[PDB]
Amino acid sequence: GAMAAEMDWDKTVGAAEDVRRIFEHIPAILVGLEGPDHRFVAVNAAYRGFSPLLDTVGQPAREVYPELEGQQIYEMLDRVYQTGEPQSGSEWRLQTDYDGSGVEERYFDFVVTPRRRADGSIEGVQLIVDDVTSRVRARQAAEARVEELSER
C-alpha cells in the first residue's frame, strides 16, 4: 500500500491538552529538553516533586545543576543531541543540589533519546529517570546485615 500520510497526532497519540495533563501526572520522572543548551521544555509533577529547584521551564539544564559538569552529564547529553545515539545508565551516582538542602549523592537509572524535527535534524532530547537512591541504600544495608550475621 502507499506510504502513510502525515501522522494524525490527535488520533495516534492523543489530543494535545489531554496528553499534557497525562504527562504531568505520569508516575515517573519525565523530562524534555530542547536545543544545544539543553533547555528545560517539559517537566512533570514527579520531576518537580523530586527536584523542586526548577522554576518555569526554559533554563539550560547546566544552570540548574552546574556540578554535573564535573560528572560527564552535559558531555553525554551533547553526544545524544549531536550524533543521535541514545544513552542509558544504571545506578549512575551523581552529586549536585536537587532540592535546595545542599549537594548530595543520588543514584539514577535513565534512558535518553534524541528528538527530531520534520527534516530529520535533532531539536532536543528527552528522558525517563528513576531515582534509585533509596533502593541502592537498602541493598547496601541488607548486605551489611548478612555480612554481620555471617561474621558472628
Give the nearest distance from C-beta 25 to its own copies in angstroms.
Answer: 5
Q: Which of residues 92-111 bind its own copies (CB under 8 A)?
A: 111
Burial class (CB in 10 A: 0-12, 13-18, 19+), 27: exposed
Cell numbers that stand for 33 in this block: 529538553
Q: Does 34 bind ligand PLM (CB under 6 A)?
A: no
Q: Does 138 bind its own copies (CB under 8 A)?
A: no
Q: Which does 122 bind (CB under 5 to 8 A by kind): ligand PLM, its own copies, none?
A: none
Could you tell me how far CA 113 lies from the centroid of its own chain? 10
Residue pair 43/51 in contact by the 8 Å Cβ criterion: no
Q: Does 61 bind ligand PLM (CB under 6 A)?
A: yes
Binding ligand PLM (rule: CB under 6 A), the pick from 94, 107, 124, 132 is 94
Closest by CA position to 38, among listed 100, 122, 99, 101: 122
Residue pair 113/80 in contact by the 8 Å Cβ criterion: yes
Name which of 138 and 144 has its Cβ closer to its own copies: 138
- Helices within the chain (DSSP H only): 9-12, 16-25, 45-50, 61-64, 73-83, 133-151
Q: Which does 61 bind (CB under 5 to 8 A by kind): ligand PLM, its own copies, none?
A: ligand PLM
Instruction: Give me the residues that bind ligand PLM (CB under 6 A), please.
Output: 29, 47, 50-51, 61, 65, 73, 77, 94, 98, 106, 108, 110, 127, 129, 131
Instruction: Give me the residues that bind its own copies (CB under 8 A), please.
Output: 8-9, 11-28, 30, 32, 34, 41-44, 48, 56-57, 86, 111-113, 115, 124, 126-128
